[PDB]
Design a protein around this ligand. Structure first.
Ligand code: HEC
Ligand code: HEC
Lengths: 125, 125
């Protein structure tokens, strides 16, 4: 869907920005600093679910650039495992949000955040 | 969800970028230049649906900035009608995509695009 490789870079950065907002905005809720409204969080995690599937198709072949480390493409398969692991952790977060259980949400949220960091540590400059 | 007003600006620009990609990538399909796969389009329009609800909450009070014209806030209510009209046109597009009818998709797509332009004409610098 990208006319030039920089279009893919702009798309993925935008997706990751939105992901970060939908993930990070829950931090005060998981910490108990903002109230826990189960319906609010369920809705938000549904948006995060959708968003969290979007960046990976914009690291296609030939889309080298941005703050991506070249190893996204030089070890594409390690990168792929890290995206699928992250998405699997999003499934656990969705289940916790659908259950309406703050303890489960806290645990899942930490799992998701660890998965973000693991990919950054290897693939972000 | 924004620590400072510029955070809202970055969020909305990112949402609108993603919206534009999910909308514009269908152009060759509606023009007949790329094949029409009803399941492909149905899935894509579901993503566009989700995305199309996201920018408006990031034009909150006090989030003046970006390439937004000041009138988004000085006539907030005209801006609001234009967002709700755009979202209503997204509903028609979703219905066309769910029906799997290329003629209906073409008509809805044109309706949506006209709604994008109508808002830009009044509110984008
Ligand atoms: C499987 C790999 C991977 C996962 C998982 C991942 N990221 Fe990243 N992230 C990247 C890469 C690669 C970049 C740099 C992209 C670029 O500049 O081309 C990035 C960039 C970003 C950016 C900056 C985008 C910009 O505007 O330039 C943010 C914000 C971000 N990530 C947040 C997150 C959050 C929050 C999570 C987890 C909820 C997450 N990421 C999970 C790989 C990942
Ligand atoms: C109800 C108003 C409204 C509608 C509807 C709307 N836009 Fe916009 N658009 C804006 C405003 C306001 C900006 C500038 C936002 C800013 O810079 O703060 C903008 C900016 C953009 C940008 C640039 C974002 C960036 O990276 O800075 C793109 C791309 C875009 N719009 C595409 C679209 C498409 C495609 C549609 C329809 C599918 C659409 N817009 C519908 C109001 C709207």
């Amino acid at each position: 869907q990208f006319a030039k490789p920089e279009d893919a870079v702009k798309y993925r950065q935008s997706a990751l920005t939105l992901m970060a907002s939908h993930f990070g905005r829950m931090t005060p809720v998981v910490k108990g600093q903002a109230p826990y409204d189960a319906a609010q969080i369920k809705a938000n995690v549904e948006v995060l679910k959708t968003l969290s599937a979007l960046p990976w198709a914009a690291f296609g072949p030939g889309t080298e650039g941005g703050d991506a480390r070249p190893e996204i493409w030089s070890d594409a398969a390690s990168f792929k495992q890290k995206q699928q692991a992250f998405q699997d952790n999003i499934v656990k977060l969705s289940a916790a949000a659908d259950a309406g259980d703050l303890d489960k949400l806290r645990a899942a949220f930490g799992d998701v955040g660890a998965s973000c960091k693991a990919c950054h540590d290897a693939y972000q400059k």
